[PDB]
Design a binder for this molecule. Sequence first.
Ligand SMILES: Nc1ncnc2c1ncn2[C@@H]1O[C@H](COP(=O)(O)OP(=O)(O)OP(O)(O)=S)[C@@H](O)[C@H]1O
Lengths: 9, 194, 308, 282, 204
Amino acid sequence: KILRLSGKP
Amino acid sequence: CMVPVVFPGPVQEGCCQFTCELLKHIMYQRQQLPLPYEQLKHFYRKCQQALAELESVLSHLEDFFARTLVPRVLILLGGNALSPKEFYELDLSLLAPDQSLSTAACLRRLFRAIFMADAFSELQAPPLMGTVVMAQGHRNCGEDWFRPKLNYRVPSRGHKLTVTLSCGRPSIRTTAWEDYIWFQAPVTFKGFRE
Amino acid sequence: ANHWVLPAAEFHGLWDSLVYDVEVKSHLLDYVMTTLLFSDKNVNSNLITWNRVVLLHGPPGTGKTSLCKALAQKLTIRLSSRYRYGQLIEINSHSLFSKWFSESGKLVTKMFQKIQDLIDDKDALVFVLIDQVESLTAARNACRAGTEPSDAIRVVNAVLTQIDQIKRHSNVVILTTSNITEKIDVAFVDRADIKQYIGPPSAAAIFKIYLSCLEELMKCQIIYPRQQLLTLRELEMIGFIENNVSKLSLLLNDISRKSEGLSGRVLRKLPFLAHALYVQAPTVTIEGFLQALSLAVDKQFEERKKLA
Amino acid sequence: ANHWVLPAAEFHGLWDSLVYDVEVKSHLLDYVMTTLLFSDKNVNSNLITWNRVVLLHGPPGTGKTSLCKALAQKLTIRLSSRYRYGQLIEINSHSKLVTKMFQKIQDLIDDKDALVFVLIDQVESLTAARDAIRVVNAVLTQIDQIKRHSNVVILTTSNITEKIDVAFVDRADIKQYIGPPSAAAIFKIYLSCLEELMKCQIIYRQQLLTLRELEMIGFIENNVSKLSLLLNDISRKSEGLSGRVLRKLPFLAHALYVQAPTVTIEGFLQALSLAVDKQFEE
Amino acid sequence: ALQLSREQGITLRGSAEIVAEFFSFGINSILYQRGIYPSETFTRVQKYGLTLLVTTDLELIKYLNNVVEQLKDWLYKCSVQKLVVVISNIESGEVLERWQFDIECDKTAKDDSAPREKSQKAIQDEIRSVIRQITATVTFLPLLEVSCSFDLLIYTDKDLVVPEKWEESGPQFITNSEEVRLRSFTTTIHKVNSMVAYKIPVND
Ligand SMILES: Nc1ncnc2c1ncn2[C@@H]1O[C@H](COP(=O)(O)OP(=O)(O)OP(O)(O)=S)[C@@H](O)[C@H]1O
């Protein structure tokens, strides 16, 4: 469902 | 279809950049240029020369609006001056030279409207075509770069969209316009692509 | 595409049903006989123009289909010492193609899969048939837009590579028929280790086929009273001398002579019209059927003249 | 897309191995023997008619590419002086390879004693089975752009007769057409066949009295030398064959009259005589 | 004198491919235009018979490639149904922008082996509609008075097929945000509705 990974700075 | 625009506040130089960004927006949304002119600032033969065509257009437009007022602006695609492949009308009739709001606010309001005006709904990718812009001007404003068309008439076919305004002013005359006369862009814009 | 087993009752009498003068039948026969025999003589290939591909060409309706089939049959029996049985696969090029690319996929997979994996049968001898070479030149490169070839030729020549692949075996017999000699694929009619012309079946063959058809009338009792026919060899030994016994065969000879270049099809058709147009009776005893045959051949020639 | 060093022994001797009808050995020498003459001093190019592009055409596989190769050979042979070595290249229509290929060719050009050669098979057959288009035009531009290098030699091979487009060979400056190979080369191809056959008693022996062997023996028409005359017989009207049909012939002969696991060669010989007799009754 | 239609057809997985690169380039352009990332550092390519904004952030390049293929997968199994890109502030991280893409797939694609009548022309021009539309949308999105960052939300109905590095998270609404819908577009297998939510301005 609501699934995230690392958004780079 | 037909779409006006609702503003609470009046203007003066707003009209200028209104037409500017509208023209730009359009020429993009008809594929004539690969990217919006606001972002074409990259990449500095047909490309730069046509873009400079467009820039001269824009500049003299600003000149013209600075000189006098405009009731109506015309932008053509193909055809000729007296008949388009398609066209867009931009009403400024409802404006006089007031405002403390930001010009950008009117821009984004009107463009959000355009989006909600649902225009440019044609899956049919048109080919690369020719473009001319026109508008009315003072009877005697001594305009130079443009040129009048004393026999001109609005053609009545391929009415893509007349963008119309409303600044919330009660009721104005029409004689203040009956003296004015269409001028024409001296050089046809061409829209390229690769 | 269809699937034949080697000798079955379909193809009995199939060889001798067809006749050709110089017995170039034999030429083709021992030709392919040696063609296969090479791989068993331990021979290389590239230094010498040869493959296992067969092409016949000439006037259409000349048994060429039947001819190659009976050829395969005779070869089969002549190679009992080398293979038990085998397959003959009708590759109806017409039935080959289909619209989209996944259809070409199912095409190549099912058909050439069957072909290949049958060729693996080292006790089966392989025979392949291509009824319409013209249908493999169906994309003969001559156009600025040869009907969007980026799906067609890529498989057609793939077929050729398939052909290549399969001719990479030893036990493969590829047969090809045209029914036209004018326009044929480049680089495939170049792969022409057989350019086999067939012509109008001339007299002696016509005579033998007459004999066969007549005795098939007789056996089947169409000709109710049986009589005695002869061979042109036998007729020549007695010197065509008109007795009251060899006369009928002399008449048959003359009919054959005057019956040149119609077709194998027209010939083995003849008896039918002979019985229908002019006889038009259930019994023909003899020399009425014969003159009827005469008039029928006459009708065929007149009408070739009448096709304007 | 292969490599060759000059005279190194890969094709050492291929030179005389292709005797042709109409002196083209000593003739075609002139081509490069004078091409490099003119290529040295940068003559009035605009004026004076030269390129560096060998080109013939004819029945395919007629020792054409082979003569190109043995030609590079003999060119170094005659002219190791102007070139203490050199580099031959197979440029294959089978096809990026082109970019680094012509880069390597630049490397070859880098040296004054590197007799560069540009060998391309079936040069116009590029338009036979037609996204190799950039391959086409890259090879084209490289051709027209590395011509000015004096050690460059362009070995083009038509493999198509007179069906050549503009970009390639109307560009040429020296051409030639040659028909079927001589009785000699016909004999050599027969020899290839008869060696393949005497490989396993296929036709069974008498070693093949080759052409120079025919010459050294002073024409002692005997057990095997009869080949010659029958050769000439099987070369009498053989003028008009194709290499395909050439090598096809012994096959067909063995098909007609042998019908056997093997015959003594002489039967096969008269058989192929009669087979070619058929083939030019046509 | 003839021609011929040769219609190729469409596949579950082909739809997945094309719509995957759809989102690829669309995300590229969105995050290009509003100022989310360094614009100057990017460039253009030719795709969809038009010109497209493409990044060079190897980090985000590989990241979004992973996302693209993973979505290709989940389309090939109709797994996901929402695709959102939530843009927020840097430090206070307040959400300003939220591009919601609501996804429809074809369950029957299990049995829908035979193709469906629809052209590369049609799909292509309709995605061109999408792209040009989104581009235009910048003309009214209230400009970012600051710099921003973003996070990537989706919604696959399955809590089942989850690969390793992906973690469950929250809805991330906005308190005062207008939502405005863009044109729709489909594959007859996958459709994607699109609508951007964005923080309602404080002052008019
Ligand atoms: N030389 C022949 N001898 C006897 N019968 C023949 C001969 N040639 C043809 N026929 C017969 O006439 C018919 C010819 O059959 P086909 O094989 O179709 O002819 P064809 O040469 O193959 O023409 P196509 O184009 O291949 S169908 C068959 O019924 C054969 O039995």
